[PDB]
Amino acid sequence: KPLQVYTADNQLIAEYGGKLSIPVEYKQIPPNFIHAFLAAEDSSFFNLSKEDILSLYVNKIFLGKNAYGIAAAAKIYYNKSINELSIAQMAMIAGLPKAPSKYNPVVNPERALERRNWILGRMLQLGYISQAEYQKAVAEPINLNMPNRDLNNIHPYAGEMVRSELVKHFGEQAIDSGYKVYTTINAKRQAIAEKAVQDGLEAYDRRHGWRGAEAHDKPLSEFRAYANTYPAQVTKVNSSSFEALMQDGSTVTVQWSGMSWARPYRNANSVGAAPSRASQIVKVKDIVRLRPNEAKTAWSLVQVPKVQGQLIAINPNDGSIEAIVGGYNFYQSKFNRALQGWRQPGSTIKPFLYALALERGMTPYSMVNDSPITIGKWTPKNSDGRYLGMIPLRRALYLSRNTVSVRLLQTVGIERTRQLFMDFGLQEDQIPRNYTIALGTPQVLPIQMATGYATFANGGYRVQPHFIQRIEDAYGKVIYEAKPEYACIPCINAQYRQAQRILKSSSAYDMANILRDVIEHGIGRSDLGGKTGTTNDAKDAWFAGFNGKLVTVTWVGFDQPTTLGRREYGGIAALPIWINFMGQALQGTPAAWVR
Amino acid sequence: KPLQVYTADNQLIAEYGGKLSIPVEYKQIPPNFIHAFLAAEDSSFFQNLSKEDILSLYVNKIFLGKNAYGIAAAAKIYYNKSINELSIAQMAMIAGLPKAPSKYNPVVNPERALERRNWILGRMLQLGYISQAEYQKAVAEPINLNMPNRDLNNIHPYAGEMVRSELVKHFGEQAIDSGYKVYTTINAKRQAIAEKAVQDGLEAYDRRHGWRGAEAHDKPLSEFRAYANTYPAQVTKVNSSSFEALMQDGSTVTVQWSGMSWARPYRNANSVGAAPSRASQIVKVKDIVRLRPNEAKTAWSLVQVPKVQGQLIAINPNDGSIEAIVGGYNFYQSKFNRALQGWRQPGSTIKPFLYALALERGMTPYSMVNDSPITIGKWTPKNSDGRYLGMIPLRRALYLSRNTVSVRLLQTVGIERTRQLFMDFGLQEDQIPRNYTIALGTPQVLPIQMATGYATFANGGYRVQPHFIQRIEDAYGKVIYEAKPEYACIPCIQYRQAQRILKSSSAYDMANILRDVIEHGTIGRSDLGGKTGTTNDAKDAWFAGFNGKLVTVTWVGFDQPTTLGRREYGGIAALPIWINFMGQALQGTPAAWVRLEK
Ligand SMILES: *C(=O)[C@H]([C@@H](C)O)[C@H]1CC(SCCNC=N)=C(C(=O)O)N1
Numbered sequence A: 001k002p003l004q005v006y007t008a009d010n011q012l013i014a015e016y017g018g019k020l021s022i023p024v025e026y027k028q029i030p031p032n033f034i035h036a037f038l039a040a041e042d043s044s045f046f047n048l049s050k051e052d053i054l055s056l057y058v059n060k061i062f063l064g065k066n067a068y069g070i071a072a073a074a075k076i077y078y079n080k081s082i083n084e085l086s087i088a089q090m091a092m093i094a095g096l097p098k099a100p101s102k103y104n105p106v107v108n109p110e111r112a113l114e115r116r117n118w119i120l121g122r123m124l125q126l127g128y129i130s131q132a133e134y135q136k137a138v139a140e141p142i143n144l145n146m147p148n149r150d151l152n153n154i155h156p157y158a159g160e161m162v163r164s165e166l167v168k169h170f171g172e173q174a175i176d177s178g179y180k181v182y183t184t185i186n187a188k189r190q191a192i193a194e195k196a197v198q199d200g201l202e203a204y205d206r207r208h209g210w211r212g213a214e215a216h217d218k219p220l221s222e223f224r225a226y227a228n229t230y231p232a233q234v235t236k237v238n239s240s241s242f243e244a245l246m247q248d249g250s251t252v253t254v255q256w257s258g259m260s261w262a263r264p265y266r267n268a269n270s271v272g273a274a275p276s277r278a279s280q281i282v283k284v285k286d287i288v289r290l291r292p293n294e295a296k297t298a299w300s301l302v303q304v305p306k307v308q309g310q311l312i313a314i315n316p317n318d319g320s321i322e323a324i325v326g327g328y329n330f331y332q333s334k335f336n337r338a339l340q341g342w343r344q345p346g347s348t349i350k351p352f353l354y355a356l357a358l359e360r361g362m363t364p365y366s367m368v369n370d371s372p373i374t375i376g377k378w379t380p381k382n383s384d385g386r387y388l389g390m391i392p393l394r395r396a397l398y399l400s401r402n403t404v405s406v407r408l409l410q411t412v413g414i415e416r417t418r419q420l421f422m423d424f425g426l427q428e429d430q431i432p433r434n435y436t437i438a439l440g441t442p443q444v445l446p447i448q449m450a451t452g453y454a455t456f457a458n459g460g461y462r463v464q465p466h467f468i469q470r471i472e473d474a475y476g477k478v479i480y481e482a483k484p485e486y487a488c489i490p491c492i493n494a495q496y497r498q499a500q501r502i503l504k505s506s507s508a509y510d511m512a513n514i515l516r517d518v519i520e521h522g523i524g525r526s527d528l529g530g531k532t533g534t535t536n537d538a539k540d541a542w543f544a545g546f547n548g549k550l551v552t553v554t555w556v557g558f559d560q561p562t563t564l565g566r567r568e569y570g571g572i573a574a575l576p577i578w579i580n581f582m583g584q585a586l587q588g589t590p591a592a593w594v595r
Numbered sequence B: 001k002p003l004q005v006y007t008a009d010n011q012l013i014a015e016y017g018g019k020l021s022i023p024v025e026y027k028q029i030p031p032n033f034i035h036a037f038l039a040a041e042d043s044s045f046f047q048n049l050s051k052e053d054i055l056s057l058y059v060n061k062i063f064l065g066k067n068a069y070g071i072a073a074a075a076k077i078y079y080n081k082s083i084n085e086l087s088i089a090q091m092a093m094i095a096g097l098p099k100a101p102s103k104y105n106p107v108v109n110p111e112r113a114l115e116r117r118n119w120i121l122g123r124m125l126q127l128g129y130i131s132q133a134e135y136q137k138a139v140a141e142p143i144n145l146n147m148p149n150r151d152l153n154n155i156h157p158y159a160g161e162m163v164r165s166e167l168v169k170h171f172g173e174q175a176i177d178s179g180y181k182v183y184t185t186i187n188a189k190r191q192a193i194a195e196k197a198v199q200d201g202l203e204a205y206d207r208r209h210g211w212r213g214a215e216a217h218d219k220p221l222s223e224f225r226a227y228a229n230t231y232p233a234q235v236t237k238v239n240s241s242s243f244e245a246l247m248q249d250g251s252t253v254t255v256q257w258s259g260m261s262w263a264r265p266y267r268n269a270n271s272v273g274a275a276p277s278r279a280s281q282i283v284k285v286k287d288i289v290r291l292r293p294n295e296a297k298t299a300w301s302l303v304q305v306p307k308v309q310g311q312l313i314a315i316n317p318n319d320g321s322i323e324a325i326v327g328g329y330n331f332y333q334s335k336f337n338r339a340l341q342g343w344r345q346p347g348s349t350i351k352p353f354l355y356a357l358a359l360e361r362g363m364t365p366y367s368m369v370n371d372s373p374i375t376i377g378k379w380t381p382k383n384s385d386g387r388y389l390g391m392i393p394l395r396r397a398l399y400l401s402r403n404t405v406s407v408r409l410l411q412t413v414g415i416e417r418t419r420q421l422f423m424d425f426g427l428q429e430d431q432i433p434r435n436y437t438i439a440l441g442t443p444q445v446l447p448i449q450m451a452t453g454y455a456t457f458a459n460g461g462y463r464v465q466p467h468f469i470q471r472i473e474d475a476y477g478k479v480i481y482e483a484k485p486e487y488a489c490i491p492c493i494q495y496r497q498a499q500r501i502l503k504s505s506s507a508y509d510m511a512n513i514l515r516d517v518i519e520h521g522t523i524g525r526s527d528l529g530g531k532t533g534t535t536n537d538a539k540d541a542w543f544a545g546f547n548g549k550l551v552t553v554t555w556v557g558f559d560q561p562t563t564l565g566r567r568e569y570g571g572i573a574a575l576p577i578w579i580n581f582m583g584q585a586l587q588g589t590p591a592a593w594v595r596l597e598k
């Protein structure tokens, strides 16, 4: 009866176990277990009387860690049936009822063993166990063999998105429901996004160079495989090749072509010279990451990036989350950068403020002033330190001119913009009450940016991102069906709630065409528009783009902001991920621009 | 549907409420409450449209802390309200709980609870769910907890608590949530008698030992509880012959000289000071005192909550049914149950067991025994009075509690046979040493075990098990447990035969020795047997006694082993409680004595 997660293509991707109860008939209980409970307590005034009353609770008793009853405890703690438990394990379970958190083997192992051994000592005294049984049982370690009750190995960020969001809003009882959650996640598009982010971050990583082995003279057993990287121990180093021991005991050779890319990393802005020998890259006893080819006939030295990234893709008509990638790989941590990654948008915020200039009567052709500006003490300068004078609004956006954005902010007013940013999705207490908000200094989430860019793809409507299509109970009854706010109700036909208009149709179409011009003046599609973003000191690289059927926002940055390096702008780091995802997601679909 | 506790006459004495859920129709929900849940988190991705639709699925299930599952259970548990009676602030408070019911709990962390609630109220304002007028009112509003008590145990507190604590001790908190109906062996008439006998008995000792001063001085009056017909008061004015005191209801009373003239100061366990002549000698302003009213009211008197403790345990000798149980002076003073958990030395109350084993080996109440000095290795046991009686009958040695005779009998019987019998009534091997001191009543015992022991004399040599549950009924009235005890005599009541641990003649001869000790060595009844006990330096006062239908054990002493005083003995401290109880418990019952069989 777990919480089951499906993709929009009816594939089960995840299963989340809640409170567990596995009832057993009383005659199925090994004698030593009942004895371990009979000996858990000093005295009973209900010794054969406790036996009759134990029979009424043996299946309901809270045994910590979502375990209700003896069988669920055997399963949760040891992955064993009640038959498989040892004297020591039976006494460990028998000691938990009194205080399952104070006596828990997971949180208090010391306190737990004190309790277990005493019960064993009291089992010995009662004649329940032999002296030999007691001697082994007391000497036995914790032996916890806790199975994973969170099956999430297909599209990890999609599965976790469901679990984590349910738990945040409805608490842990949300899992205990046994519901089937049918998401808006497209499994093909999700598989594409996962591969694209992985490739994008590795491309960035390799050009920034080899940072050395992740560990030296440490046990290989202590490392784990992920993102098609396999831990290995270097055993032999040759002039052009090295030998490594895999986690299965097999010895592999990595030839020159497999490691030659390994120029040493110096900093974000510097790599050393191409390596002239294998000895400059690896040491014997080093823990490296290898990747095989499809045939497994050749191996290469690979590297997990230190840089991070994310992708979020939504339908601009209804806000359906089609694909979501929260980091390089889910094994690293459960942290989802699309939903929780607060970062500065920089220039990706500019189309929002320029669309507000269009609301006021300006056209993409209207002349704007790119001349020096000073407000109070602050002198907003341009990233190139140049001033272009009278230029068209569209050129000013394309070139991301800070003085123009600052001047546009005064002409349109701060509150009017803050309100629009709030309309676009953005958080009220995250949007400052100053002029820096024309530069993309407020913190945003990639999902908010996707939501805001949808206003351009949909004709000026505010959509709300959503991941649930429908929910069923365990019996098959549909208990929830998504009723999103639609930008275009007749577009579903190719139904009920109409989304609110946040921009004039003409402002949205004008902005969409500027972004299309911005994309075409750098794949084989004429229905895409997009905007790059780079924060100060290249701490962030963004790409926010779309067609009329899909909005995609990509981001690249370090979790602890450090520069990505000069040369690492939006169009260089984030855009290739977007291009790779968009090109494959929109492959063999007609042109879909704005209505 | 709570855990229900019943007396043997099918009357409800306790209700223990566990996990609570009061489901509601979604239309019955105030919109402001739904809005509070919408303002609880910054971002919803299921402007909070879809969360409102999904909320309905979880609204009656969400764990809200303190056994509350769903909104209505939370409104009841925290505020003793229905959802439609909650203020905007209280709605914001509950909506703050789902994320971390223990990190935001108003009981556990009131500052984190307040911070979270105000954030939610702030968001309700920003989102336009509440007007600034509503917001300003709501943030200034305090926590205002009004938590009802869901553990109802105000009739026979030690009886109700026995069930709750014992079910939790063996089965954990799931035992309370079961909703089972526990039909106990407790006799309500007798339980009521037991409570008063212990209270009267302890107040009698306490008084003889003098006024030890107010329980507190310059401490908040709201931190004290009324119990055992004693009400905490704050002394506000001290006159020459009287004193004024502030009661918890907010009223002020006057206690005249009559109600405080008794207050002789406690000097030590053996000394009481000079009778007071003025109020200042007894009380000071800001003192926290205990007062007692009357049958109606009119007059209040200065009373004293005893430092000394006691207990009473009454069991049926045929099947071990627990009829009456008092764990201390008052359960509201101490939750601790001394009958079940109070390990103490029995002293002379263990002697009848040893003397019964000597009768088992062929001696009679008349066999001559030597009360004379003895040395067992490096140990010389002495008689408490430092007197030696020479050659005397066994029964005189038992009545007078001759340690030297006890030691000689232990040599005749053997330590092992003695230890085996001690164990036959719940005594742990670990709790009984393999030495000659066991004859002097040195092992630590529980009153419940001594009661079980004395039932061997009352029943004719059989081993019975103390039991407090007759049957268990599920929430839907089905009998899910029926007690199957071991009966000493089956025709006497209907299946299990109890194991004989003592020869019929030994049990019967001991019973008559105990009857003699009670009729000539100290109630209008002749079917009674019993033995007093007084440990060294009077650290314990005991009285174990019976008739053929009821075995009662009473104990008096300080929880921290301290002398009851030179002059205090079992016969003076524990025996009067036993008397008061037995006389009243056995009223209108025909004579009931022990049966002999060859
Ligand atoms: C927007 O992202 C910023 C803006 C906040 O200053 C500018 C900077 C760049 S990159 C050009 C760097 N200057 C070279 N001398 C962009 C961009 O779109 O990435 N816009």
Ligand SMILES: *C(=O)[C@H]([C@@H](C)O)[C@H]1CC(SCCNC=N)=C(C(=O)O)N1
Binding pocket: B346, B347, B348, B349, B383, B384, B385, B386, B400, B401, B403, B440, B441, B532, B533, B534, B535, B569, B570, B571
């Ligand atoms: C039993 O409790 C003890 C025995 C084990 O020593 C004796 C002592 C007394 S009191 C007699 C006065 N002694 C001091 N001079 C009793 C008793 O039961 O009261 N039995």
